[model samples]
Every structure is written in C-alpha cells, then in structure tokens.
Target chain A: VTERTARRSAETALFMRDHVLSLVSHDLRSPLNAIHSWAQQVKLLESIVDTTRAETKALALKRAPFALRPLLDETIGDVREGLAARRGIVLALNTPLAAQQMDGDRERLAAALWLLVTFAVEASASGTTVTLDADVDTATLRATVSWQATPAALTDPALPHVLENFARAQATHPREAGRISWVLALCKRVAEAHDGAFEQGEFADGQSSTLKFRASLAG
Target chain B: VTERTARRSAETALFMRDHVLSLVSHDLRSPLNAIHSWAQQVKLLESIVDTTRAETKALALKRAPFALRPLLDETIGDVREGLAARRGIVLALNTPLAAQQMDGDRERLAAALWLLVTFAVEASASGTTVTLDADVDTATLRATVSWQATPAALTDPALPHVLENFARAQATHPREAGRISWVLALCKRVAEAHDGAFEQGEFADGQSSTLKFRASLAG
Candidate 1:
C-alpha cells in the first residue's frame, strides 16, 4: 500500500484510540466543560448591545458609488491557509469586477461581506473550493458565495423559532447568542439594514452549495 | 518543502481539530461514558473468576524445552507496521537465538512477549525504533524490547499508586487499565507467575531516550 494510505490509516487508528481515551476523560471524568463555557458567556451575551438596527439604520443611507471588488477578492484570504493546512480545503475566488459602481452604503456592505466569507470558510472541507463573486444585474447588486453549507449555517441557533422552516423575516433587534448563532444573526441584521434578500440553497449535486446576498442597486 | 512535511503538518492540524472535538464529546458532553464503561464493567469484573492463576499453576511445569523464536519474531512484525504507519517508528530485532531450548512454559511466554512488544509500540514515536530480541546466556533467558517511552507512557492512570515513582511491585489485583497500562501490567503479572524477573527502565541518549524491558530468562 502507499505510504500516505498507510500513514493516514495508522493516524486514524491512533486518533481513534486517543479519541476513545478522551471520551472517557470528558464524558466520564467531568460534566462541567460545556456548562462552564456557557456560564461565562451567557452573561456577556446579555450585557452586549447590537449595532445593526438601532445604531446603523437610524442614519439614512448616504447612497454613494462604491466597489466591493477588493473585499470580494479576499474571500478566503485569511481563512484559507488554516483550512488548507488543517482540513485540506482549497479556496478559489472569482470576483470579476473592476470597482463596479453601486449606489449603497459602502461601509455597511463591507462588514456584511466579511461575515459571509467567514461563514463559507468555516463550512468548507477538503476538496471543496469556496467562490465569492458579486455583480450588478439590471436592478440588484448580487453577492454570492458558491460552496457547500447546511441550512443551519444561515440561521442563528439562539432564535430557535426565528427562521424555523424558513418562514419568517422581521429584522428586529439582533440578540447576542452563542458563537456561530451570533455571527449569522449579525450578518442577517446587515442584510436587513440594506433592504436586501439573503438566499441559501442546496446545489443540484447535493455535494456543493451556495449562499447569496442581494440588494437593489437600481435607484 | 517536502511532501512529507506538508502532509505531516496538515495531518497534525486535522488531528488536533478532531482531537479537541472528540475530547469535548467525551470530556464535556458526558459524565457517563467513562463511568458508563466502568459501570457496566464493574459488575462483570465482580462476576468473572480468575481462571489463569487457578488453572495454570495447578498443572505443574509443562516445562518442555521449547524454542521461542517463532513468537518473538512475530512480536515486532505485526506491531511495527501499524506503528510505522501511525507515527513512523521502525523496529529492529537484536535477537540472536536459534530457538534455544527452554524448560519453562512454552505457550506461556508467547502471550507475555506480545504484551511487551505492544507496550513498546505505544510508547514510541516517529524517530524511535522498538527492538525485540531474546537470547539464552549461560543461565538466563534474556527477552527484551528496547524502545523510547516517557513517564506518561509507563504509568497507569487508574492507579497513581500502582507504579508511581516506580519501586512498589507487588502486582495487586492486576488492573485492566488503558492501552499501555493494562498490557504492561499483564506482562508484569506473567513475569511474576514464572518467578522470573521483569525489567523496565528509561535511559537517555545523546539523541533521545530508550525504554528497555529486560526480564531474566532463567526461571
């Protein structure tokens, strides 16, 4: 057999053995690790204030021409190395734009763009490539990430009923929640502020997926 | 950089990720897995009877002069493959034996030899090589596996007092501990039964350290 196969096989075996050992340590030895993490976090969640709706929307959008090519080009810049190093996933970007002008809040979409790329990176695995591109259609600025993701990636877990079955959208106060849940909620809040549509769907292959955020670029 | 370096770096990163994930599943997710094993096992342990000591000793010495070359040779063969694959440790046999006739338990030493090899395999890493050998001197049968091990590898966690700081060798109640712990323990018990000396040591070299199990072959 090939050395890689042998090495990976043995590594898996060793990992499994250690996995079983740690399972005993965490599962049997103590029961406080999760609770301990939450105990320190729950209060922090309550103490925080959301910046999207109240602070951001109160100021009417200073509609201006801004290009998102730079940020879109950096889809997995910071995250790809680690993903490739740790999970064997590679990232490719296809931002075919030369600062195409869109009349919108330049700053708002910038933060929103960052969140989507991070989300894509976290969900991607080995052999999967994440693609981020944005273009202005007849009436919309369409930003999309082509990669694999579960519906759970698009929804905030804390709001168990917020997007349950994908049947609701109110753009209310963004509540602070657990790690992943909070990030998605924050992203959703930005999309809401921009009066945009955020779409998530499974690909036809069922192997790769796509997430898109769009706002009307047409005045 | 070499493919080996790249592969190992990725492998370690993946391993650490999975390692922490599994650790959480075991350590924080449940207080039942560890205790669950023992909970189920404690009852069985209480229910089982010691057939080895009661049955094996009663039948006087089945002490026929038997050659141990076959089993000892097989010792390093199987164990080395998995270890080399997993951690890249090779094995060397310094054995210089022609199946020299020994007048002790023939089948007995085979099982005991297996444990020592396994123990050495577990304790070794990529740069290390575990050596298995046995030869008859003027009055003693010398069986040994020379490899490297750390303090953690040599001790059983279940009983800190079992072999802590070395020097307490009464072999009480033979614990069925984790991988290295239990096997080493079982080996020690077999050595005790034969009244032959069981050896364990860790010595440092200019490059690294070595662990040796030198049991007196003379019964």
Candidate 2:
C-alpha cells in the first residue's frame, strides 16, 4: 500500500479507538452523579450506595456465530494499517484454529482482539515482527500476541500510542485494579462478560512480552 | 411534512438519542470495574475508593464562544423533526435573549438542551405545543421547556419515546436520585460540568411541567 493509504488507515483506527474512549468518559458521569447525590442526601450506608450503582447495571451480551479466520484477518489488517506499517514493523499470524467457527458477541470480541494486537504493536520496536498465535479447544478459543517489548517506546513523549487521549495528546496510564490501563479496560470487561480472561505481560526492553486473551466458545 | 419524511425524522432523532445512551452504558463499565476491583482487593476504606474513582476523572470542559439564537433554533428543529412532527405536536420557541453570546462547551450544552426539549415533548400529548423559553443575564444562560403535561402519554405502552433503549424497545425508567431518569442524567452531568444546573418539574396530568437547564455564561 501507498504511504497515504497506510497513514489514512492508521488515522481511521486511531479515530475509532479515541471515539470509544470519549464515549466511555461521557457515559460515566450519570452513575457517578447518582452515587454522589445519594451520598449527599441519605448520608447513610455508603457501601449500599456503591453496590447499588455498580451492580444495578446489567451487562448483556448479544451473541451469534461468526467465522474465526476472517475476524483474525480483519483485526490483523487493521493493526497492520493503523500501526505496524507506519512503525516499520511486521505482523505475523499463526492460527490452526483459523478455520473454526465460534459463537459470541462478534463486535465486542473483535474490539478486544484489536486492542490486544494494537497494544503488542505499540510495545514493539521497528523491524520486529509481532507474532499472534491462535488456537481452539472444545470449550474455549484463545489468541495471544508475543513481542520483543520496548516499554519506553509505548510511553515515549515523541511516539503516539493508540491508548492515549488523542485530543489532549496525553497518555492514560494504567490505573485499574489489575493494573490494566483504563483505556484498555474494555478488553478485560469484554473478556469477563463473555466468560473469558485477558492477561497482560510485564513490559521490559529486549525481553519477550505476551498478551493473552481467551474466551469461551459457548459465549 | 410528508408521512415518510416525518417518520424518517423521528427515526433519525431516536437513532442519535439511543446512540448517546449506548455510549453512556459502555463507558460506565471501566470506572465501575475499577471500583469493584478495589473493593474486593483492599476490603478496607470503601469510602475512599468510591471518592477516588469519582473525583480523579477531570471533567475538562472545552470552552468556546457561540451565539445563542442558532443553538436554540437548532435544538428546536431537531426536537420538531424527531418527536413533535411524528406525534402531531407543536414546538414553539420564545427567546428574547437568543441573540446574546455565551461561552461554554457548545457541544455538551447543545445535548443538554436537546434532552430537555425532548423530555417535554415526551410528556406532552399529541396536538399539544411545547414552549421553549430562553433567557440570559450577566451571570447565567437559561432555557426552559414547558408543556401541558400528560404523564400517561410518556410511559404509554404504544408510543415511542426518545429516552427508551431503542434496540430492545424497552423503557429505562427513572432511577437516579431527584427522580431523574438515568438516560437523562447527561443533562445534569453536562450542566454541573459547566457550573450550571438542570431542574425537572413535576409531571402531573393536565398540569404544567417544565425542564430548565441553566449554565454560567462565564464557562
């Protein structure tokens, strides 16, 4: 692809990613506003208020069957266009489970996969090939990205990462309970919602880093 | 307007409104996830965890100066096309302060105003005219939507309202403190974020009901 094409693709992916972050930011105000109001008026049972606000919201998953290979290819193409190409890095996919068909929330799963790959790409140096391996068992499907980790490159003042607040050009560092970055919270949330798990490997330069995502095929 | 055009307009407005709701639902997860994790892991100082999560997110407003008349007109037109037109209801505007200029987050304020008017329209019966009155002083800018309230029409099993979850055709009833519906929490959040206030009048049949949104001009 031409330089212009690659740049445009990356821009599109970044735009989508940032839009998701903005949506999350805006949506949060309502519940927080409610919790604050309850605390002010009732001034009793702070624990109950927190639980009410947190647990009342039902996280419903819309499930359907989708092909595994195409989803992987699409995610790869997106990461390649959005980051790998620009960073002068290679993306290699190895999936014997590519031909398997799975059932779940395709849109949410696609986003989780995208974030996992994008994170791996961000933590890699130029000329390195990030490897994505996928496999399936009777009960679960898994995808993992391994890379030669360059932690500094991710938080570099100069290089742009997909998880940063694009408008302010500020990094949203990891602060979640699992030490997961707030921006990437979608990955953990989606995984758990689907009876899956997401694990982030420790980042260290010149060392192998891995990001693993696993979901139940039963959805 | 033609039947097809009116139906399409209502569909468009409903689409935009539902999208906002969906965004809010998606974003709340990250913070709630964090809160739940902290509660589980630390198991101490529940108050601090809740406060920390709520207060840490800086609700930075992007301030800009804009004329009042156009924004009011735009909101009226959107409500008219989206709800009023289809329901055979009338939307009338009264704004002596329309020509004045104000500084604030224009996008956020626009959404707040739109929700205010839409709520009034939802509470009104067919053929009723919802009045939108605008005023501004040195300190504050205000817009109020007043209508002859028909409480039954809003939660009617047959009629569609903008605040309902469009995807499932289900109602998201008011659950917030102050009896405000969760979907409409954006109004209060946007107002408070701009150092403003949003007030909701009682909804009683054949009585006057109003939604007032006021923001500081200094914002």
Candidate 3:
C-alpha cells in the first residue's frame, strides 16, 4: 500500500496471532520436556534403589523350580543391549542339558541375573568375551558368571561392599550410579534372600574375577 | 561347605528361568523409555505448532469470496492449540452468515488470522475472553479482532510493522526477541503477499486495541 493508498488500506496490518502462539509454546516447552526427562532418570535410579529398599518392604518371597536354560538364554540377549555388544564384547553361556532346571522365585532372581550379567559386562575388557556356566551336582546347583577384567575393574576395591551392600556399592564401581550397580546389588540380595551364597573367587589371570551363586537344586 | 551345612541350607534358593526375563526388561527399560517420551513430545508440538505454522502457512493468491465458516473454524482450532483453550483464555467468532466470504488467499488469510488470534491472546487477561468478528458485504471482508489487553500487548510498537514485515517487526515489540515477535513477523508477510492490507483501530482503553484485515472480493 503506497502513502495515500496505505492511509486508506491500513486496517489489515496487525500481527497478533503469531505472537500469542510463540508466547504460549515457549513456556509450555519447558515443563513438558522437564517432566519427561525427569521421569526417565527417576526410573533409572529407582531400579537400583529398589534393589535394597526391598528389605524395607514386607516382600513376599516365593520359590519355585524353574528352568535355568530359559533364564540363561534371556540374560544373553539382555547383555547384548548394552554397549558391550557394539564394543565387540561377546557374552557366552554354558548350561548343560540336564543341569538347566533349578528352583527359585523368578521375580527376585531376575533382578539377580541382571546384576550378574551387567557386572560381568562392566568388568570385562572391551575386546574380550564373558562366559556364564551353570552346573548341578547331586542336590546342589551353582551358576557362575565370570569375565577377564579390564584394567579399570581390577583395582575397584568396592567389590567387597558389592557383596555386603549391593546398592551402597554403586558409587564404588567404575560406572557409578548406573544400571550395572543396582543389578549387582540386586544379584547379591537375591542370592542371600534365597539361602544361596554369592561367591567371589581368585582372579584366574592377573585381573580376571570369577563370581558364583550357589543354591539348592530343583527336584 | 560341608554336606551337613549344605543339607541345612535346603529350603531357601531357586534360580529359575525368569532371570533372562528381567534381564531383558532391564536393558529394554533404558532405551524404550527414550522413544516413548520422544513420541509424546513430538505429538504435542505437532498438535500446536504445525496447526498454525502450516495451518497458518503459505497463502494462495486466489481472490475468491470464499466462505468464512470453514476458514474461521479451522483458524479457531489452530489458535485453541496455542494458549487460549488451556490458559482460561477464551476465543469467540461472529460472522453474519451471508457477509462472511470475501475475495482473497485462504493461505495468506490464515496468517492474518494467526496474527489476529495471537494479539488477542496476548491482550486477553487469563480469565477473560477475546472475540473475532468478520464483517463483510457484497465485496470487501473486514475482520475485526478485539480483546482486553494483558497490559503487555497494547503498548508494543510491533503491531504496526508486524503487518509490514511480520518477521522483522519483533525486536521492536515489548519483548525484543521472542515467540510473539517472530510469529508477528511471519503473519504480516502472509497478508501482504496475498494483496491484503492489515489495519489497526484506536487503542480505546488504556489497555486494548482492535485490529482489522481487508482484501479484494472474488467475483
């Protein structure tokens, strides 16, 4: 609209709607995004936190004779989800055909396996493989998870605390306050809760550590 | 451990197969958590931003006396996606059935609308209403956008130029570089590109201003 034309054609020029939309979108973006992000972090912490906090709860401890073959297969896939698989870290298992059956609470021990495999993955060197082996003798069963330690895992003194207080030992592990920590904590507690023992053996090589969980065999 | 000790420890442990199940759940929890959160947020923005950004996008140069019912309804939905529907802010429209359509680009007109609704939203008090009235006849369509000012939108000088350089007019508004400003910049251009003129009436109260947009009518 020119000067004279502009004076005549002036009523349609105000930019009002665009302003309000942006105004609204700006403030709205923050809280929605924050809540979503926070919810995730909270859940992650809860996974580990709940591991020991269960002691604080009146938990129902259920036991049953379930097959180890299925659990072992499951843990392998779970471990693959971590950076390990991408880092060329191989997770292998050895559960003999007949030795595969055992008895326990699937709910609680699931958390135990998470700790077992995750820690093995953590302590493992990038290029090396970690192995899981399960065996049954007479009326006793043992499942062992072991890996060659990366240099970082060797000096981690918190290994002992990981045995005693799984949750508290998180800060002591290489990956502090992450999934691996809680899994380890839960694994220990699961074994103890079921009258099983969480064992630590001598590092076969200079830095490799072998851990074992032993309990009653399934009838 | 001795056989007696082993025999005494028979009732508590069962390493069932669900270890793999929770193991899978653990890793799955980390990654699946991300996508679900992202999906929700993306959907949210799509509901609002695209509503006007495109619902408010590129105008067509066709000067047809188009029906305003559909146009008004569409614009209302877009603006509602903004802060109006949720902030206790209100939006209302008035069009005499016969006089509603005028000649102009619906695309460009939508931008003008975005401007109209936005400014109204800004000027509106949280607990109040803003109304849009499209006055027209056999030829020209006059869309009068009116509301009570939030005290912030009234004094902003960007109103004049938001019609001229919708994008460029912002830094001059009360908020130098912000959402309301940029939207204004986009709004005005949309109008002029389609041969429409933006108008501003007197700021009657110390609080608010009424605005208009006029364009040719299609035969």
Candidate 4:
C-alpha cells in the first residue's frame, strides 16, 4: 500500500513539475516582462517559492482560536454563490451545536471544506441538494457532505460543472493505492497535516455519495 | 539512485499539494466571495485543473517554427530587468550562430532557459557575470550557463536574490539520483519531454557552476 501510495504521489509530482513551470512561463511571463510591475511579480513569486521550501521542510500551521459556526457559514455562503446557485442546486449546512473555539489553521480548514462541498455540488444534477453535516467532539471536528450523483452529468463532458474537469475525472476513476484525483490530493494532505483523515465514498448516479474529513480540535 | 530520486520527487509532490491548495484557498477565496468574478476565476481554475490532468497523461508539445536567437534574447532580456539588474548581476548570452528556425514548443524551451540562467544569477555575487552559451546543430539545441558561485551570497539569508528560496537551497544540496532541486525539476521534465536531458554541474565557493539542457530540434 505504501508503494502504491508512493507511486500515486510520484504521479502528482510529475504533474506538478509541468504545472508550476506552465504557470511561470505562461501566466507570470507577461507581468515578469513588464519592467514596471516586475517588482510586484517578484514579491508574489517569492511567497510561492517560500511555500515550496516550507512544505519540503515541515508544514507549519498558522493555528489560532477559531469558532466553527462562522467558518462553516462563510464557506457554505461562498459555495452557494460561486457554484450551487449557478448550477440550480441548493446547499444546506447542519451543525449539531455552535462548536467551541478550536485551535487550527482557519484558512486551510475552510479550503478543505470548500473543496468537499464543491465536489458534491458538481456531482449532483440541477434541483438536487447537497447537505453538509458538522459535528464536534472534545478532540475532533468532523464534517460530511452527502449528495446524489447523476452519472449523466459527471460523464457527459457537455454538461457544465462547477468543479474543474480534473476533480470530476478523479472522483470516478478507480482508486488504486488510495489515490484519488491529484486535485483532491489537497484534502488528504490537509487532513493528515492536521492529524486527521479524509475519505470519499462510492459516487454513482442515483447512489448515495459521501465525502468527509476530520481534524483534531487541539493544535 | 532510483530510490533517492523517488524521495526527491516525493518531496516535490508534498510541496505541490500545499502550494495548489494554498493558492485556491488564499488567493481564490476573495474572488470567489465576489459573485461578479467567480465565473472568471472558475474559468482560470479550469485551465489549471486541466493542466494537471494533461500532465498526468502524456505531455503534448505545441510544436511550430521558432527562432532560437530570439527566444534566448527575450528570455535574457526579461531576466535582466526582473532579476539581474535588480541584484547588480550581469547576464551574457553567447550563441555560435543565428540558428535556423526550429520546431518545438518555444514557450517551454524559453522557460527552461529562464530557470537555468536565473539559477546561475542567484548563485553569483553582485558585479559578477553569468554567461549562457547556446548552440544548435541539425539534431539538438543545447544551452549552458556558466557562473562562479558565491557561497556567502547563497548561504546568506540576508542577500537579495532573484531566484526563489527553494531553488537557491536545492542548487547546492548534494546530487543524489541526479536531483539538483525540486524547482529545477521543470528543466529535467521539459528536456525529457522533448527527447533531451538537463544537467547541473558542481557548485562550490569560487568554483565553476554550470547548468544545461538540450532538446531535440526536430521535436
């Protein structure tokens, strides 16, 4: 299993090699060419470069005390406007209680939640609903997204989707060595980074699909 | 050596996971919050998503007629303004002849050259010059960068440099599995993508350091 996971990680590295280079050469090339804005671009690049270096060493979490309700509301609100609403879908967030303040990286957790919900939204058909339930224990915070997948929407390249093409493709691809799509690699990494785990359940048309992640409450 | 190489590649994958997630969560967050711009951001994200998917598949080259001299000159010109000039390092490009138009991905080649020279410039001290020699025959296009490494400048956290922190760090690390650094993985991937190769020579204080890549001209 470790070998299989490593192989999948290697696949991710291969993709990233081309991905970062493409960004630098294609997206940053124009601004880097302009003398007036090169400074700004350089500054932006410095942060990115540092990010790679930081990741290679040890992932540092910007932990702070943060509440769950507001973060959940914010993430769901953005998903509603950016994806669900546009696709004629609805989002419902259910939290057992107003969770106590926990120490963790707010932005990272929010991103994980965003990806989880967005993936579900993309799988569902118009008029379908994606529901997220959040529960917090003394030690861990867990969130789950439940939706009904429309095989037609997922497999039909013609259909408009909120999530990117790669995410959708990986969602359905046969999982070998616990590897999903490279896009959602972030969710797994984020969960592990915070002493937690993320899982994606069976996703099929007219079948119940679930994606979830849990992180330790204490930093 | 294969095991060592796999370790480095694994490091790179780890970094990329955080980097892409950070970009989506941090940079794209604000834009997604603004309903007016979500479409544009989604469009942009789609391209990036597709890029990852494409890389995971076989790399495709958009081959066409492109001049070597112009590409080198443009890459140098941009590096000069964006990095060399700011750091007081000089860039010198030497070509054996104005090679005929070659068929390959101009943008990809340009990126490789940019990274090679940028790495050299970062290793050199102010007032020191980094020289690049480019040659083309019927078979291959080869470019080499020669520079004298300033150990103090590279190790100095205080120095102003053009290349990112990760690149500078990897440039000097011991060569295992022919790995120079994760950032330079692009040069290797690009070279091989074109049926060519990339290499980084010894870099020591006041010693000659060279980085080069060659690509099949015919693509």
Candidate 5:
C-alpha cells in the first residue's frame, strides 16, 4: 500500500479504538451514577431521622438533662436493625454511658457501630450474644463490640469483601454460610473519615472476635 | 400510665426508628460506592490508551508525526467511544489545537464531556447535529455541548424541580412522546468538587429548543 494510504488506515484504526473506549466509559458511569445518588440519599435520610429522634428526646424537661438510656436505646435499635433481622443474632448493649451525649454525627457514628455489631452477629452461631460496650477517657470516647460465635471457613475475609461490595453481594446464602467482613471495613472507613479509628482482633476463643472504634473531639 | 412505663415506651419507639434509619442508609450507600469505583476504573483505562496513542504517534524517526490526521482520528475515536455508543449521540470536537491538552484529570474530563454529549443526543431528534466544542483560555479550559431538541410539554414546572433535585430536567408525556431532558448534574458535581464550574441552559429556536452545557477548568 502507498505510504499515504497506510497512514490513513492507521489513523482510522486509532479513531475506532478511541471511540469504543469513550462509549464504554459512558455506559459504565450511567449505572454508577444511580448507585451513588441512592447511597447519598440513604445517608441523608438516616441523618434526618437521628436528628429528629435526638430533638424529641431532649424535650424532656424533668431529668438532670443527662441520661444514657435514650442513647443506649438508639444504639441498640441500630444494632438490631443491622443484625437481628438479617442474621438472627441478638445484641446486648453493655456500656456504662449508653446515654452520654457523644460528639459525632449520631447517624453516621451509630451506623458504623451497627456495622460492627452486624458483623459479629453474622460470625457468631445461634444463641450467642454480641456484647457491646463504651467508655470515655478525658478526651476520647471508645466503643467495643465482641461476639461469641466461632469463625467458620466461609467467614472473616470473605464476609468483609462481600459487605464492601454489598451492591453486588449475594443475599441468598444462609447466614452461617455467608461472609460479613465487609461490615468491618465499612465501619472503619466511617470512623476514620470522622477522625476515628476502627480495629478488630481474634479473641482467646480463637473463633470469636472483637472490633473496637475510638473517637476524640480534642483533635 | 406510670412514669417508668412512659420512659420505657419512649425508649422502645426511639430504638425502632433508629433501626429503620440504619437499614435505609446501608441500602443507599452500597450502590454509590460501586458507581464511584467503576467510574475511576474507566478513567484509568482511557488515560492509559490515550498515553499509548500519543507516544506511538510522537515517534518522528520513522515518519513525520502523522500530522493532524492521528489527532483527528483520536478525537473522533474519543467522541465515538465516550458519547455515540453509550448514548446514541454524535460529537464534533471543534478546536484549534491538533490535540488539545489541559491540566485536569483526563478521564474525569472525558467522562464529563461524555455525559454532556449523552444529554445532547437524548435531547436531540434524528437528522440534527449536536455540536461539541472545547477551548482553552489563559486561565481556564472550557467545553460546551449543544443540541436542538425541544420538550413537548414545556409548561410543566417538573423540569425545573428535577433539575433542582438532581440537575436533570425531564419532559412531560404526550408533548414529544418519549423525549426527556437529562442534565449531567454528576458532571457538574465532579467539576465543582475540583473547583471548576458546570453550567447548562436551554434556548428557544423559533419552533424548537436547544440545551447546552459549559464547563470550565482553572489551574
């Protein structure tokens, strides 16, 4: 072929490739846009509801203006919603100031804690308690969530990955057979985003585990 | 009712509300994370390909850099891949530079342009041109996409409402059956996040109408 003709042909081929790539990018982003919008809406809704709840409870005129019951109840509710219905796991909120006025985005912080509880519930076997606790240092607040369920072959790493990709994660699997590790990572991200830390470790039971998160207002 | 009974009832109600809110929030964010991840991946892929094409074309040892033809071909390829295949929109990249380069995330910028083109194609009827242009000023680069397609039921204020909520304006039915308007609000958000601007408007063209977007970048 002539040099001009060869050059033209090469140009045409390159054009085609660029065109195809752009099309793929467009198609991929469309569905993704929908996902992002929906997720943000959910977060907004949660924040709205939590703020409303706090407003309503604070209207109580009689008490010392400080009580842990309402806060504990809110935390328990979040834990139950995330874990009990989905995995049949029960949670016991064992914190001293379950009603303390913690400084954080209540909805987001509660959601993160719920994720930890749900992970523990899914990892634990039937008739087990996912114990939750909290305490306050001079400047920081710390919360711990532990479960008695033994780690199974289909648990840990797989569960976390699935939760991280929950949009595509399978819901059809039995509670015991599926993974829940994704919840831990999500909780960590949420906490870290707010200048907090989330950590998890295996317990003495070898199969059981605990996840803890800490947040400070001073920093 | 007794004081203790009333307290317990309030706690129970608050707990229930919290639970419901958490579930909804979890459902929402899952999809958003997916979209964000996929968009990033597509951007990476396109950048790699564009870099390769540029490097190969810059080889002056064997040939006088295929002149403007390679750039045009690549532009066409970009238009086709980014807009035509995904949204059935054709793009005409009108610019002075043989290959325009700007200081911004290429993939993101391309994605934004793809969205604009898609919006134009959706708004435009057949046998019409949807013009796409890009220009660079001393301090900013700009892209504008325009199309001539009017919504039938233009009286309904729903278009504005949708635009306000999601930055998309949809047409009502029976006016121009199956014809609706979609604004690249996400593109606008992406641009604004990067300290850029994304603007869109509609113009009456005697009997028909046209939609356009102008996005600017600085630094």
Candidate 6:
C-alpha cells in the first residue's frame, strides 16, 4: 500500500508540473509577443522613413538628411502604451535638445529606452518618479535612467531578494518584481552594437538604482 | 556565537542575491534587446507594406495587391540568422504547411516559438530529435511540439512533485508540467487573442512527450 501510494503521488506530481509549465509559457508569451510586435513595427517605420529621406537627399543635394526624432517619438509612444497604466508609475523624460540629433535608428533606440523606462516603472511605487535622461557629450550620446524606492516603501526587502536571484540565475529569470530587467540588458547590447556601452548600478543612497548607456554618433 | 553565525550567513545570502540580481539583469538584457529589436523591425516593415498596399488599393482600385510574402520570408531569414546555435542538441522545425498563417503577430509568434525551441533544445540529449509540429483542424489551428527522452535517462519522477508546488502557486501556475506546459498555454493565449485556444497532453504510448495548441481562424 505504501509503495502504491508513492507511485500514485509521483504520477500526480508529474501531471501537475505539466500543467504549470503550460500556464507560465502561455502567460509569458502574450506580453512577449506584444513587445516583439511593437518593437518590429517601430523599426520598419524608421527604416522606411530613413531610406526615403536618404534617397531624396542624395538626388537633390539640397536637403539635410532625415533625423531619427520621429522614430524615437513613435517608440516612446508605443512603450508608453505597453506599460501597465494601473501601476500608477510616472515616467519623466530628460533628453537634451542636442541629444535628439544623435544619428541612429530612433525606433530601435526608443525600444531600448522603453525597456529602461518600463523597468523603472514596474519597480517603483505608486506616485513615484522614474527618470530617463539623455545627453550628448563630444561625439557620443549618453542616456541614463533611474528608479528610486518611495520613502514609505524604502526598506522593503523584496527588491533585494529578487536582485539576488537575478544575479544567481545569471539574469535569465524572465519576470522579477513585476519588471523585465532582461530587456534592459538587451538595450545595453544595442548600445554596444551602435559603438556604445551600457552600465547599471545601485545609487549611492542605496534607495535607488540607475542604468547608463552611451553610443557614439558621427559628427 | 551561534546567533552571530546565523546573522553572518543571512547577510552573506542577501549579498549573494543582490550580486546575482545585478549580474543577471545585465547579462539577460542584451539578448532580450536583440530579440525585441528584431521582432519590432519585422512588424514595422509588415505594417508599412500593409498600409501602402491598402492606400494603393483604395486609390487605384484596379491593381492587384502585392503579397507581403517576400517581407515575411526576409523576416524569417533574419530570425534564422539571429538564432543562437545551441551546442549538443538537434533543433528540428516540424511545423506543417497547413499550420502556417495561424493569425498572430508573426514576429511575436516566432519569438515565442524560439523560446520554446530553445528550452527544448537545452533540455534535449545530443543525437536525439526534438520535433516541433503544427496542425490546423476545422475549428482550430494546432501546433504540437515534442522531445523524446533517451533510453538511458531516468524517467522523470520530479514532474508530479513540481506540479503540486505549481498548483499551490495557482495564479501563476496554470497546469501540470508547467515549466514545459506553459509554452503551449502561451501559444493558446496568442491564438485566443485572435479568437483561438491552446492545450497539451501526454501521448498514450508514453514513449514521447507532446505539446498541443489550438486556435480558430474563421471565427
């Protein structure tokens, strides 16, 4: 009877794992699909606009090259729409005018930027601020975004626990603290692909965190 | 002394978790960004072509609409190029011709599919086939992917144990074998978003495992 009970229990567990796996995969996939689709839409729009502008400029020799600002704007809009509105987190943009002219695929950059913003928003408390800063220095453009814990929630330990697991898993865990930090890592890579660097750190105050990304632009 | 030791251990664990969080956050972000960027690019291209086609049709009313097949072909090609070649595993594409055009964002579907493929590939034994299949029935379009176990490997008794834990986490864990089953659920949700459904089950023969997804095309 004992042996039979153990066997039944094992079979039951196997059945259960199968069910859970199915659910997580499905849940994770939906948002993932949305993110993927929006990002691609932005990229395609940027490419079309860019190619058209470039061809027109080459033919007329009078027009300036197309800027990536429109793409960036579209990207930002898409990202804002993607964010869970009920989360009650606010996003503040801090891009200097000079930084806006930094040449690149604005849509792609926007997608990367959106990841940082989304991460900050998710980690933040209601009515808290998540700041995104972009500036130009010499031939490089740098963007920095930060997330700070609210005064009332400053001492919560859940964030730290998640951060620990994220580090141990080598950043492979998909969802942590209701934010997708993995996407931020992807943004950093995009910066590298554009001849840049990405850096993230806890703030000196220990109550906040930040990610800084830098990319070179042709003068 | 015992209390001091315990305190020290707790601190160390906290430190480790924080460190892991930072590292994982940084590492995973890069790949995810690439995935997001590429997926977004594909969607944008499709949308642009679609919009242009729609406009042209409205004006001309006589010209036949150009197919977006080439763009899709290119996008799929890009995905193939972007796919990281996994070592020590065989990745097979077993999707049926009938299963093509299962009405979700192609790029998102691809990314989700890639995740499922990657998971299976990582878990599969070398020199074994990990088959991915897609089918379209009258009421729904279904995709069933499976990976067979090696004869020498121990039969997984852990499946049931994991399922029980998964059941406890009911909100997140949807069904049994969630780790694997969730992928199917994702497919189903994607289908459902387009008015379809997804499901999975073990084969009666028990020699090979299976994942099944169903989505309605007409409705």
RMSD of each: 19.7, 10.3, 25.7, 17.7, 23.5, 23.6
- Deviating ranges (above 4 Å) for candidate 2: A1-58, A65-102, A114-139, A145-183, B1-57, B67-101, B118-132, B148-183
Model 6, span B13-132: residue lDDT tens: 222222222222233445557785663233422422332233223222222222223323332333233221322445555434522443334533443344334334333455656666
lDDT of each residue in B104-209, candidate 1, tens digit only: 6654465456556655554554566777767767766667777665334334433222121221111122322321222244355455556665655433444343
- Ten-residue stretch with the least lDDT total in model 3 chain B: B8-17
**Clash pairs, model 1 backbone:** A26-B26, A26-B27, A27-B26, A27-B27, A27-B30, B141-B217, B141-B218, B147-B211
TM-score of each: 0.31, 0.58, 0.33, 0.53, 0.34, 0.35
In angstroms, the error of model 2 at B71 is: 4.1
* Alpha-carbon shift of residue A213 in model 2 (angstroms): 2.6
- List, residue by residue over A1-219, the lDDT tens digit for candidate 2: 433233332323323333333433334446555554543112222322332233123224378999999999988997787778888779999997646888888866777787778777776778888988888988998889998877556766566445433312212243335555433555666677778887876664467778888899985
How many residue pairs clash in model 4?
0
lDDT of 5 by residue, A36-155 (tens): 575534444443444333433332222222333465566677546544544556778776774466545553455566556655665565567788887777766688887775555124
Q: What is the lDDT of candidate 2?
A: 0.62
The interface root-mean-square deviations, each candidate in sequence, come to 14.5, 14.0, 32.7, 7.1, 27.8, 18.3
Docking class of 4: incorrect
TM-score of chain B of 2: 0.70
Residues B132-198, candidate 5, lDDT per residue (tens digit)? 6666566555666666664431333322211111112222222223222323433554455445666
Model 1 CAPRI quality: incorrect
- What TM-score would you give candidate 6 relative to the actual structure? 0.35
Ranking by TM-score: 2, 4, 6, 5, 3, 1
For the record, the alpha-carbon RMSD of candidate 3 to the native fold, in angstroms, is: 25.7
Among all windows of 10 consecutive residues in model 2 chain A, the one with the lowest summed lDDT is A39-48
Candidate 3's displacement at residue A204, Å, is: 6.7
Evaluate fnat for each of the predicted models and list the values in order.
Answer: 0.00, 0.00, 0.00, 0.05, 0.07, 0.03
Q: Which candidate leads in lDDT?
A: 4
